[PDB]
Design a protein around this ligand. Sequence first.
Ligand code: MG
Ligand code: MG
Ligand code: MG
Ligand code: MG
Ligand code: MG
Ligand code: MG
Ligand code: MG
Ligand code: MG
Ligand code: MG
Ligand code: MG
Ligand code: MG
Ligand code: MG
Ligand code: MG
Ligand code: MG
Ligand code: MG
Ligand code: ZN
Ligand code: ZN
Lengths: 100, 269, 222, 92, 114
Amino acid sequence: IKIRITLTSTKVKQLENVSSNIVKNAEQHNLVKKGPVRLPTKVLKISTRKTPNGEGSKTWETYEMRIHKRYIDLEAPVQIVKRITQITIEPGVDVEVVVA
Amino acid sequence: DPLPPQVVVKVVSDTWIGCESTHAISFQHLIRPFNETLQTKLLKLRPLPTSALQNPLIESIYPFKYFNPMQTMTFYTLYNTNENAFVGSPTGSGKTIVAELAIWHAFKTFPGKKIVYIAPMKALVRERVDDWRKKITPVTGDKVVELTGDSLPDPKDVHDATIVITTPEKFDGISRNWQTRKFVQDVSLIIMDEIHLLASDRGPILEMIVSRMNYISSQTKQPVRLLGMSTAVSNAYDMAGWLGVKDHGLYNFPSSVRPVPLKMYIDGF
Amino acid sequence: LISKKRKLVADGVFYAELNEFFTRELAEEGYSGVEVRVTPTKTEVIIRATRTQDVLGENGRRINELTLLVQKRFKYAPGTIVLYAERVQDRGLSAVAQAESMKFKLLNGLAIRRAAYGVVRYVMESGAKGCEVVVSGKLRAARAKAMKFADGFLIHSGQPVNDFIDTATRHVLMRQGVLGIKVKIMRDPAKSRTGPKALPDAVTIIEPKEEEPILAPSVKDY
Amino acid sequence: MLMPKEDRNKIHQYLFQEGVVVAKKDFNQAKHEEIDTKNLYVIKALQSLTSKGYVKTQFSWQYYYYTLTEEGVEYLREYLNLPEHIVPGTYI
Amino acid sequence: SGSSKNCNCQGTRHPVFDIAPNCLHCGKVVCVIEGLNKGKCGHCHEQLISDKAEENPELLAAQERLDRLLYFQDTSAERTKIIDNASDFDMNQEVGLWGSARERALALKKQQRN
RNA sequence: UAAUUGCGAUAACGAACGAGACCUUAACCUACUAAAUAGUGGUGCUAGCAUUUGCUGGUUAUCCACUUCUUAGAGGGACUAUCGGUUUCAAGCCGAUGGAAGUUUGAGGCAAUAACAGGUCUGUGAUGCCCUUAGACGUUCUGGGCCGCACGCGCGCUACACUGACGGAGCCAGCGAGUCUAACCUUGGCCGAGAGGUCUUGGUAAUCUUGUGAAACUCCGUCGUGCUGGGGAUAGAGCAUUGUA
RNA sequence: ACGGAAGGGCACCACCAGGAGUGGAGCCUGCGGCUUAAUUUGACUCAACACGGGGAAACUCACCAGGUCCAGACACAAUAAG
Ligand SMILES: [Mg+2]
Ligand SMILES: [Mg+2]
Ligand SMILES: [Mg+2]
Ligand SMILES: [Mg+2]
Ligand SMILES: [Mg+2]
Ligand SMILES: [Mg+2]
Ligand SMILES: [Mg+2]
Ligand SMILES: [Mg+2]
Ligand SMILES: [Mg+2]
Ligand SMILES: [Mg+2]
Ligand SMILES: [Mg+2]
Ligand SMILES: [Mg+2]
Ligand SMILES: [Mg+2]
Ligand SMILES: [Mg+2]
Ligand SMILES: [Mg+2]
Ligand SMILES: [Zn+2]
Ligand SMILES: [Zn+2]
């Protein structure tokens, strides 16, 4: 069935928490699991002039958003897969799953 | 039924104006156990009454030919399948016939077994046997031996007995001997009624019995079919997951549907 | 089908759209921030204000329209958006709210010296290690000058400022011109309870228990 | 301006049952969402009611959220000649 | 449709086949997915569809209450009603006659007559 | 001492902000957790040469294993560690060894009190006032100009050559970006000197562009101290693309 | 605060030892000037001059010569289904 679940929170600490519970949730049911894989952090940089007018020493800021991504692969028949998505929803940590 | 945004408390004085305070209580801790499973009555217009049974031995008995209407999703599901399932039937809506599916479930596959029935109170023991003295034994040639505290039957008769009816406390004592009691090896299906007594004192006696068989099934590595007889129960999900039942087959009907309508009235004193 | 490179970028702007909406809509109802919660098929939002009944209203009116405005504007399917109304805890500690009161006090002829110094005593009373209020612009004179009122102590340097002080600004409309409000409030670290619990340089020692010498080899058997 | 009665009739009756209408601040865009008319009329026909104290307006990054006020409810009722408490926007 | 996917959900996760709600031989419930892809049972491989006095009197008499049971389930929303001794029972359809008081004006006229 | 950073002396004591600490990034871990959206080895099918045991290889549903290399999460790791000199022997300083790191380890983010009549009304549906508000300083359409050139300045790029120019070949990176109601990043095929064009492809992206096979670079050839094959504004002619133009 | 005053100590927006340079030549761009209908405009040592994130063909646009529209909400009064 090849259940593939992706997790792409902007925040890492709670993402690990919502990831830590999943892997133990598979083994507690004695289910085959393929481990979490942490993709490289996506750093979103934006470099802009500091000043709102055009005057002054040429001072620049850059702003970084970190987009951590995690995903864990599972295989199981359908009866125990629909009982996973509907739980473990935490703020700013979206969860998406793809079958097959 | 439509979940409101919140549940809010209001405090208001009775003499002044505006002496009011408000708190909006959110409820988000809504988990899959926190629900009623239930089933909607589907289109089951055509039954399989008696004719579609493939056993003339029993087709010659039980003169009530039409199949039970309230067994819509039950019908022949457990008749052939070995899978544990929960059947919650409010009131006396077929408690006699539905409890008799144990012979239908796996007795034809292997006959001459000692499938054990369990009743919550000793009163149910007499009716579960006395009414059946002229319905099954004279036609199926299978004897039933009651196992109670006031009865001490010959163990050879118990071994040769087909159906055993025992209260959980009396069943507990014989359940203390699974290590050496050669009587208890033929357990393939265990059936009990009024399984929602756990809130009572006797519920703990019955509850620990099921977990005993789960270890037996887990340790001995063979499946043991279970069957639950009860009325509508609020926490259907948690008990279903504890009996080890699976998606195919689950009976949860509310008090709205009954063989006879029920009228109610409230008063205070 | 939107890349997470843009999906979440669009997700943060959805929060920023909503926040600037409310502080324009429920400003007098003690708006104190918001957070966006995402659930599969369920989109829920938590509104923080001091008067929860006014945010909610009879028959859940105010939320029902506010839910209804967000319903139409962002083209949600019916019932896919749910609003939550909640109070702000420790209203005397939140810079967003205490900024509004200063915007309230000024408009009512209240003295900038008296009105500002009023909020600072209550903020420190409500559990703040430090707090200050800055008011800028024309004050009793056409020449612009700024007066700063402060109490306690505040840090200007390091990321603890992000962690330990919250910012708030609310412009004031007055027929002398615009008088600015800037509020930085330093909550008690001892009640942080999420991440750090004290300043980085705070080093504490647990007191031991002294013990007198036995002065003798002694025997306790079993 | 001079413009058919068909759509102000549509505009106000639409504003009636739900009580919120949203129209972008995009001049001459000419196609409102779920209103086949042009935003030009939607944007301006309403502050007139606001001008005579009937509805309230926000900018919110030029989106023009609209919602009728408490006494805005009845005025439309005789405008559409519906009965008292036909289908207000105060439905639960 | 010739699909080999034997959907044995028994209607648990799929709508049941209206024409063939079950199997005539072994009682397995056949959903819509199991219906169009195959006309044969998945369990016992029995055909589901063949290519008042005469009818058994108890078969049609039985389904009469089933429709009632379906009616009971369908009309179960108000079956939880409570008569009580404190229930006002304003017996109004949706309003108190449009919130207008002229139906009882004749009662005042009757009082004037009395 | 980089430091109102410390020792200490002391009509001051106890405090506070700045400094530091803080955190992001960078190098260490053959250690925990793992990983065809990463790789490595072996094993199946298979190409070439000596064939004898090899070397170079190709192969996704051929498998199995692993995490050194790549990813992170969780952690440790530097505090000048130790040794010797010098100083009331006080903060320290200097040298040496070890250590991935010993000029707060490098680079940053952060960054006070007071002030400028600095810049900004041409970001603001932020605003006080003044002007105008209907052949409007408002809005919107066609075409100009913001680029016009006697000259004077500032940031610059390109060179004046043999450490060179040009023709061939050798052949190596990192930070990034990229389509849904759109038409983005485009491989491959084919056409075309070239510019570029056409039929398809994968990609909402550790998986496709992309090993971004870049250049300066390396070697082999041509030239040869000639304002020359240096240098390429100037002009002119034609061929495609962008976009209504 | 200032000192062609003193002590002590710093800094390649200082110097020393030096590199690579710029100021010389072509061009790209910005500012002044000249011009024109207009060549919109802010900033003039450090702390302006490849700066307004300003590499403007329309648009951007503020300017020049022209051409359409009113977005006058709202209230009051006037005309008024010949
Ligand atoms: Mg091979
Ligand atoms: Mg030493
Ligand atoms: Mg540093
Ligand atoms: Mg400005
Ligand atoms: Mg220009
Ligand atoms: Mg410059
Ligand atoms: Mg060469
Ligand atoms: Mg690379
Ligand atoms: Mg040349
Ligand atoms: Mg230096
Ligand atoms: Mg020098
Ligand atoms: Mg040079
Ligand atoms: Mg300087
Ligand atoms: Mg133009
Ligand atoms: Mg132009
Ligand atoms: Zn199905
Ligand atoms: Zn069958």
